[PDB]
Design an enzyme around this catalytic site. Structure first.
Site, mmCIF file in Angstrom:
data_model
loop_
_atom_site.group_PDB
_atom_site.id
_atom_site.type_symbol
_atom_site.label_atom_id
_atom_site.label_comp_id
_atom_site.label_asym_id
_atom_site.label_seq_id
_atom_site.Cartn_x
_atom_site.Cartn_y
_atom_site.Cartn_z
ATOM 1 N N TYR A 38 -26.587 0.180 54.441
ATOM 2 C CA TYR A 38 -25.297 -0.423 54.116
ATOM 3 C C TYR A 38 -24.834 -1.341 55.248
ATOM 4 C CZ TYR A 38 -24.907 2.979 50.330
ATOM 5 O OH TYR A 38 -25.147 3.700 49.180
ATOM 6 N N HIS A 40 -25.141 -3.476 51.550
ATOM 7 C CA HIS A 40 -26.236 -4.140 50.865
ATOM 8 C C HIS A 40 -25.696 -4.796 49.609
ATOM 9 C CE1 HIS A 40 -26.686 -0.223 48.556
ATOM 10 N NE2 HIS A 40 -26.705 -1.115 47.581
ATOM 11 N N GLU A 58 -21.859 -3.939 48.782
ATOM 12 C CA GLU A 58 -21.165 -2.668 48.767
ATOM 13 C C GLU A 58 -21.254 -1.990 50.123
ATOM 14 O OE1 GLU A 58 -23.023 0.833 47.000
ATOM 15 O OE2 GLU A 58 -24.363 -0.509 45.911
ATOM 16 N N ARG A 77 -17.218 3.369 47.201
ATOM 17 C CA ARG A 77 -17.613 2.107 47.821
ATOM 18 C C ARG A 77 -16.555 1.023 47.661
ATOM 19 N NH1 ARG A 77 -20.763 5.503 48.382
ATOM 20 N NH2 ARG A 77 -23.017 5.583 47.964
ATOM 21 N N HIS A 92 -19.236 6.699 42.229
ATOM 22 C CA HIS A 92 -20.257 7.343 41.398
ATOM 23 C C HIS A 92 -19.611 8.533 40.692
ATOM 24 C CE1 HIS A 92 -23.813 5.185 42.636
ATOM 25 N NE2 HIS A 92 -23.717 5.551 43.902
ATOM 26 N N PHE A 100 -21.767 3.470 38.414
ATOM 27 C CA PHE A 100 -20.447 3.424 39.035
ATOM 28 C C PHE A 100 -19.371 3.204 37.977
ATOM 29 C CE2 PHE A 100 -22.858 1.660 42.745
ATOM 30 C CZ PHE A 100 -22.356 2.475 43.753
HETATM 31 N N1 LIG Z 1 -25.238 1.449 39.767
HETATM 32 C C1 LIG Z 1 -25.571 0.403 40.522
HETATM 33 N N2 LIG Z 1 -26.416 0.534 41.548
HETATM 34 C C2 LIG Z 1 -26.623 -0.616 42.242
HETATM 35 C C3 LIG Z 1 -26.067 -1.839 41.990
HETATM 36 N N3 LIG Z 1 -26.505 -2.797 42.887
HETATM 37 C C4 LIG Z 1 -27.326 -2.142 43.661
HETATM 38 N N4 LIG Z 1 -27.469 -0.818 43.339
HETATM 39 C C5 LIG Z 1 -28.500 0.072 43.948
HETATM 40 O O1 LIG Z 1 -29.542 0.157 42.952
HETATM 41 C C6 LIG Z 1 -30.100 1.480 42.898
HETATM 42 C C7 LIG Z 1 -29.780 2.104 41.529
HETATM 43 O O2 LIG Z 1 -30.570 3.284 41.330
HETATM 44 C C8 LIG Z 1 -29.473 2.218 44.077
HETATM 45 O O3 LIG Z 1 -30.381 2.024 45.200
HETATM 46 C C9 LIG Z 1 -28.127 1.494 44.237
HETATM 47 O O4 LIG Z 1 -27.575 1.532 45.574
HETATM 48 P P1 LIG Z 1 -26.381 2.510 46.002
HETATM 49 O O5 LIG Z 1 -26.776 3.853 45.509
HETATM 50 O O6 LIG Z 1 -26.416 2.389 47.462
HETATM 51 O O7 LIG Z 1 -25.166 1.953 45.387
HETATM 52 C C10 LIG Z 1 -25.193 -1.979 40.902
HETATM 53 O O8 LIG Z 1 -24.701 -3.045 40.557
HETATM 54 N N5 LIG Z 1 -24.984 -0.801 40.204
#
Ligand SMILES: Nc1nc2c(ncn2[C@@H]2O[C@H](CO)[C@@H](O)[C@H]2OP(=O)(O)O)c(=O)[nH]1
Ligand SMILES: [Ca+2]
Length: 104
Positions: A38, A40, A58, A77, A92, A100
């Protein structure tokens, strides 16, 4: 009252601005922290209608009030863009899998 309610976690606008400031600085310096690296890119798979333009990034916002510095990110986040504008606060909590939902 909470400006942002993520599940049971309560956040004020100042909490969000503080987290965002930290995340944006690491973003500008090209550094990351935590096992999930992070801040990212946030691809917005959810398709949220943010008022500010992408790219989105995020960064964890912690219910403890502390600024994220590694370790467990929790479920919440703050999402900000390249202009350091706040897009929203998401979580989450209450979402299936790794999806999310926005904090109310
Ligand atoms: N749900 C969700 N996950 C995202 C998104 N962009 C990046 N991710 C990342 O994509 C993967 C989804 O399985 C995770 O590594 C998640 O990171 P984070 O868990 O850090 O948010 C988004 O727009 N939605
Ligand atoms: Ca607070």
């Amino acid at each position: 009252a909470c400006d942002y309610t993520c599940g049971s976690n309560c956040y004020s606008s100042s909490d969000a601005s503080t987290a965002q400031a930290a995340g944006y600085k690491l973003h500008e310096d090209g550094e990351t922290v935590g096992s999930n690296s992070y801040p990212h890119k946030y691809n917005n798979y959810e398709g949220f209608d943010f008022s500010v333009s992408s790219p989105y990034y995020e960064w964890p916002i912690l219910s403890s009030g502390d600024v994220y510095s590694g370790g467990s990110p929790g479920a919440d986040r703050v999402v900000f863009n390249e202009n350091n504008q706040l897009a929203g606060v998401i979580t989450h909590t209450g979402a299936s899998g790794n999806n999310f939902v926005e904090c109310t």
